[PDB]
Amino acid sequence: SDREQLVRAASTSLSSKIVSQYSSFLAPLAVDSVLKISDENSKNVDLN
């Protein structure tokens, strides 16, 4: 869990999406969603 690498990679991955201007609060949104499920086996992290 790293707030520097995950947030900067999430906002960059948006790129031309319309949410790029809204990426300020949206970048921590996608990071904190995945951090709730953590495993050392590198599971696919089901999005259900």
Summarize as ranges the residues that interact with other proteins (CB under 8 A): 5, 8-9, 11-13, 15-16, 18, 20, 43-44, 46-47
Nearer to other proteins, 11 or 31 (CB): 11
State in angstroms the smallest separation of the CB of 44 from other proteins: 4
Complex with other proteins: residue 5 or 33, whichever CB lies closer = 5
Q: Which is nearest to 20 in space by CA: 12, 32, 28, 29?
A: 12
- Distance separating the N- and C-terminal Cα atoms of the chain: 21
Helix (H, G, I), strand (E, B) or coil at 16: coil
